[PDB]
Amino acid sequence: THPGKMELVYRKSDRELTKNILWRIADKTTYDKETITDLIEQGIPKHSYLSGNPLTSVTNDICSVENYETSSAFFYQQVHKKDRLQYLPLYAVSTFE
Amino acid sequence: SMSNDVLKPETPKGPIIISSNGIFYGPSFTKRESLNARMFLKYYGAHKFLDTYLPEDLNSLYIYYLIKLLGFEVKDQALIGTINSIVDPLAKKQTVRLIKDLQRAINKVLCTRLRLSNFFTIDHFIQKLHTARKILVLTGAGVSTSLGIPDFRSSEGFYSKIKHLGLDDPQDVFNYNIFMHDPSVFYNIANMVLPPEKIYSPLHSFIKMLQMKGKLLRNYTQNIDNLESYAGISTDKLVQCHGSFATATCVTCHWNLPGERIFNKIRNLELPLCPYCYKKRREYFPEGYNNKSMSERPPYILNSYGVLKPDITFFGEALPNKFHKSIREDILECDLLICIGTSLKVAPVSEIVNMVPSHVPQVLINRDPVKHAEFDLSLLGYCDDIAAMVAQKCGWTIPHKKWNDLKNKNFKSQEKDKGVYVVTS
Ligand SMILES: Nc1ncnc2c1ncn2[C@@H]1O[C@H](COP(=O)(O)OP(=O)(O)OC[C@H]2O[C@@H](O)[C@H](O)[C@@H]2O)[C@@H](O)[C@H]1O
Ligand SMILES: [Zn+2]
């Protein structure tokens, strides 16, 4: 999987998280705000948002003009029926029907 | 001048609807609340989303509901029933099993496009064409099938034809690593991919037409047939992202020569050989194994030694520099995106769809839906039909021979879903 190379598009970090959570958790039976937020936010890639910039990509610059060669966006946006979570498609239109 | 109002959410009121508490009913959530959440996430970032939608003090049970709030259902059976009955409340294990799945959920939304609520229809697309000064068009193999050239992935396609000569992955035929080890694999089928001469479809002329009206920002093609240039598309407007047969290159000495010079050799299924490497090659391959006893070939010499290769882009190879230079100046500056006749399976080209600004409308013209992309509007059917139909509705003239016959031809547009239309005749 070389960067910027033609490729047919169609994990130690995982256990790193399980380790990293169980550590900050085990000594406490009452979790905190800043605790759990910071516990979530470290499993989420760097990203920008529409207020900070209107030119933000549809993947939130997780795949952008600068990083597209290393883009992990294809990986996150694919959650197969095999996967744990089930994804509910939600689309609303403004219509005169 | 942010046009992202359509994508801006309404700041909801306070933390989520929970704070034994509601074991069966639960703080239920509605599609508008969920979709508004997804919008909120993508609008303000993950941080703000986390801060606002959560109480100033909490437990581990919100972690499950943030998942339901974003419109996800956790499929883990033992976990469900535990939650149904129960109400820190949660175990240590499950609490981790939760935090993970929330991160996946957040990442899936952050990495997923949200369709524009105000662009769902054929008329929208038409009206947009009139107002658009920068149009980015991405064409695949489909735009050429009407000329007899089969596409790659259809049941009638290239990969199927060679799958019947045998191979595990017919795509290996275009693999770069394999070419270096065994150039014979590619050259066996190479004649099949040789471009025809001086022809183009109506759809090519449609892109030609957009260029004449000054509305065409760039045309990115994955096609190596070079038909684009014949239809009149200019060198500055055209990018062949996958290379072209225009030239070929020795993979050892890096010499470069006019592509036509190897066309006969390819028609005859002979290895095209570099004149300048032919000296040393003959020592390693005395017997003339070049066609469709290796004892004299040392471990540091592969079969591709002294072999020419066409400048088209193999899998695992690097795309032309022009691609990278162009995308960097193009993606941000573009007000419309149309995809024509491509399954969108092959990166980085496919990632154009993921790297574009959020307000930019995305339109798909193809015989099949692209399921892994969120397209505002998808017209399903033959791209020549669909081109004629659209050109009519703009009161436009396609500069093609087959126009005079097509301009009167009538097409039926049947809506199968919102933003989805089946165009026929
Ligand atoms: N006349 C047509 N009109 C509209 N769509 C068409 C038409 N003909 C075929 N199609 C559609 O075009 C798509 C075909 O594209 P692919 O066969 O997948 O090839 P493409 O996406 O253009 O390129 C992928 C890349 O893979 C590489 O191996 C190869 O170099 C190619 O550039 C299919 O979804 C098919 O439904
Ligand atoms: Zn050479």
Q: What are phi and psi of B135, to 5 degrees?
A: -120, 125
Q: Is residue A93 part of a domain?
A: no
A24 min Cα distance to partner chain B (Å)? 11
Q: Are B320 and B241 in contact (CB under 8 A)?
A: yes
Full domain range(s) for residue A31: 11-78
- Give the separation between CA A49 and CA B382, rounded to whole angstroms: 37
Rounded to a whole number, what is the distance in Å from the CA of B97 to chain A's nearest CA?
9
Are B21 and A25 in contact by the 8 Å Cβ rule? The answer is no
Q: Which residues pair with B238 in a beta bridge?
A: B219
Q: What is the CATH number of the domain that holds B11?
A: 1.20.120.1710
Phi, psi angles (nearest 5°) of residue B234: -80, 155
Contact between B273 and B307 under an 8 Å Cβ cutoff? The reply is yes
Phi, psi (rounded to 5 degrees) for B416: -95, -15
The domain tally of chain A equals 1
Task: Please tell me whether residues B157 and B228 are part of one structural domain.
Answer: no
**Last residue of one domain, picked from the residues B278, B297, B320:** B320
The region, left, alpha or beta by phi > 0 then psi within -120 to 50, assigned to residue B395 is: left
Angle at CA B344, nearest 5°, toward B339 and B349? 85
Q: Please report, for the domain that includes residue A61, its CATH number.
A: 6.10.140.1820
Whether B5 and B142 map to the same domain: the answer is: no
| CB-based contact A59 B354, cutoff 8 Å | yes
**Among the partner residues B46, B75, B359, nearest to A85 by beta-carbon distance:** B75
- Same domain for B310 and B249, yes or no, is yes
CA of B367 relative to ligand 1 center, distance in Å: 9
Same domain for B175 and B298, yes or no, is: yes
Q: CATH number of the domain at B310, please.
A: 3.30.1600.10
- Chain B residues with CB-CB distance to A54 below 8 A: 2-4, 357-359
Ligand 1 atom 25: residue of nearest CA: B346
Q: Å from A87 to nearest chain B CA?
A: 5
Show which of B261, B291, B320 is a domain's final residue: B320
CA-nearest residue for atom 21, ligand 1, is B342
Ligand having the closest approach to the CA of B309: 2
Contact assignment for B108 to A85 by CB distance below 8 Å: yes
* Nearest residue to B317 (alpha-carbon basis) of B224, B219, B180: B180
Distance (Å, rounded) from C-alpha A92 to C-alpha A94?
7
**B290 shares a domain with B172:** yes
Binding residues of B for NAD(+): 140-159, 222-225, 341-343, 366-368, 383
Q: How many domains does chain B have?
A: 3
Interface check A54 vs B, CB under 8 A: yes
b (16+ CB within 10 A) / e for B94-107: bbbbbbbbbbbbbb
Indicate if B269 and B388 belong to the same structural domain. no
Residues 6+ apart with CB under 8 A from B134: B215, B217, B333, B334, B335, B336
Interface test mutation site (partner A, options B39, B111, B415, max chain A beta carbons within 10 A): B111
Beta-carbon separation of A74 and B3 below 8 A: no
Instruction: Judge residue A47's burial from the number of C-beta atoms within 10 Å of its C-beta, 0-12 exposed, 13-18 middle, 19 or more buried.
Output: buried
Question: Domain range spanning residue B27?
Answer: 1-114
User: Where does a domain end: B88, B114, B140?
Assistant: B114
Contacts of A7 in chain B (CB under 8 A): 315-316, 346-348
Q: Tell me if residue B242 is catalytic.
A: yes
B22 and B105 both lie in a single domain: yes
Instruction: Specify whether B69 is located in the same domain as B180.
Output: no
Which chain A residue lies closest to B63 (C-alpha atoms)?
Answer: A36
Q: Is residue A52 part of a domain?
A: yes
Q: Is residue A24 part of a domain?
A: yes
Q: Would A22 be classed as within a structural domain? A: yes
Q: CA B98 to CA B59: how far, in whole Å?
A: 12
Using CB distances shorter than 6 Å, the residues near ligand 1 are: B 140-142, 145-146, 151-154, 157, 171, 174, 222, 242, 341-343, 345-346, 366-368, 382-383
- Residue A34 falls within a domain, yes or no? yes
A96 to chain B, any CB pair closer than 8 A? The answer is no
Name the phi and psi angles at A36, rounded to 5: -60, -40
B55 and B96 belong to one structural domain = yes
Separation CA B415–CA B423 (nearest Å): 9
Experimental technique for the deposited model? X-ray
Task: State how far the alpha carbon of B79 is from the alpha carbons of A29, A40, B86, B90, B391, in Å.
Answer: 19, 19, 11, 10, 55
Angstrom distances, CA of residue B122 to CA of B62, B386, B390, B418: 42, 11, 9, 11
Residues of A in contact with B59 (CB under 8 A): 30-31
**Same-domain pairing of B285 and B313:** yes
- Identify whether residues B22 and B79 lie together within a single domain: yes
Question: Cβ–Cβ of B71/A87 closer than 8 Å?
Answer: yes
A94 occurs within a structural domain:
no
| Three-class HEC string of chain B | CCCHHHHCCCCCCCCCCCCCCCCCCCCCCCHHHHHHHHHHHHHHHHHHHHHHHCCCCCCCCHHHHHHHHCCEEECCHHHHHHHHHHCCCCCHHHHHHHHHHHHHHHHHHHCCCCCCCCCCCHHHHHHHHHHCCCEEEEECHHHHHHHCCCCCCCCCCHHHHHHCCCCCCHHHHHEHHHHHHCHHHHHHHHHHHCCCCCCCCHHHHHHHHHHHCCCEEEEEECCCCCHHHHCCCCCCCEEECCCCCCEEEECCCCCEEEHHHHHHHHHCCCCCECCCCHHHHHHHCCCCCCCCCCCCCCCCCCCCCCEEEECCCCECCECCHHHHHHHHHHHHHCCEEEEECCCCCEECHHHHHHHCECCCCEEEEECCCCCCCCCCEEEECCHHHHHHHHHHHCCCCCCCCCHHHHCCCCCEEEEEECCEEEEEC
Domain annotation covers residue A29: yes
Q: Within this chain, do residues B154 and B291 fall inside the same structural domain, yes or no?
A: yes
Distance CA B226, CA B198 (A): 9
Within a 13 Å sphere around the CA of B387, how many CA atoms are in the beta-carbon half?
27
Q: Quick check: is A25 in a domain?
A: yes
Resolution (angstroms) equals: 2.9
